[PDB]
């Protein structure tokens, strides 16, 4: 790895600089280097890893959606323009799949197996579900069903731990439930499951807000608002 010669602490420091500079590809490379040092990640470091790759894959997903829409229009009275749209959509798709495979590979070697505390294990299992979900967004062939089940299985394991080990207002638990509800609505063709999960999650968090400090209340209610926004879109 090109980061093998850099100190762990220097990689973390540079990841934070890259974030400030909006250099998310660099940020992701630095955080991959940090993970590959083999030590477990702290809370802050897990969040840097997630921010970096979410921004990288987010740009790829946005580009893929633009190109897929153009390709779909071309296949409706539409003039034949050759293979270029498909080729370039495939190029972006392959790069997106490569990033997802990179993240999944870090989780499998060896972040998840070393994560014993609920906060870390739930975080990584949620990430596994998320990156399989991004793979499912672009999957078509004989792999779509297995990719969807991999996302579902990771989210479900994370949900089971989070319900046993975390309060209903915990921001990781809330973000997991939010993303699993999105999985149900957008990937698994299960809008009723999505709505039910978002509603129950929101209501159980509401009933636990009284236990929180002002700062924790702000953290939790920010994510609850996303659940409510989806419920407004879905109903």
């Amino acid at each position: 790895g090109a980061m093998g010669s850099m100190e762990r602490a220097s990689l973390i420091q540079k990841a934070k600089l890259a974030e400030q500079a909006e250099r998310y590809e660099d940020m992701a490379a630095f955080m991959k280097g940090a993970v590959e040092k083999g030590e477990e990640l702290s809370c802050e470091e897990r969040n840097l890893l997630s921010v970096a790759y979410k921004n990288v894959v987010g740009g790829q997903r946005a580009a893929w959606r633009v190109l897929s829409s153009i390709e779909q229009k071309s296949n409706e009275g539409s003039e034949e323009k050759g293979p270029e749209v498909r080729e370039y959509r495939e190029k972006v798709e392959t790069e997106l799949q490569g990033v997802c495979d990179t993240v999944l590979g870090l989780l499998d070697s060896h972040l998840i197996k070393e994560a014993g505390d609920a906060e870390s294990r739930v975080f990584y299992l949620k990430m596994k579900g998320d990156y399989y979900r991004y793979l499912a967004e672009v999957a078509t062939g004989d792999d779509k069903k297995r990719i969807i089940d991999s996302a579902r299985s990771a989210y479900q394991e994370a949900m089971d731990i989070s319900k046993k080990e975390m309060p209903p207002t915990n921001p990781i638990r809330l973000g997991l439930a939010l993303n699993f509800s999105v999985f149900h609505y957008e990937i698994a063709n299960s809008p009723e499951e999505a709505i039910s999960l978002a509603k129950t999650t929101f209501d159980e968090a509401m009933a636990d807000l009284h236990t929180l400090s002002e700062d924790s209340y702000k953290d939790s209610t920010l994510i609850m608002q996303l659940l409510r926004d989806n419920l407004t879109l879905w109903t």
């Binding site: 998320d130 939010l178 993303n179 509800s181 957008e186 994510i223 996303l226 926004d229 879109l233």
Partner: peptide, 8 residues
């Protein structure tokens, strides 16, 4: 309109 997922 696409659904909102977790923010960073």
């Amino acid at each position: 309109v696409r659904s909102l997922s977790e923010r960073l």
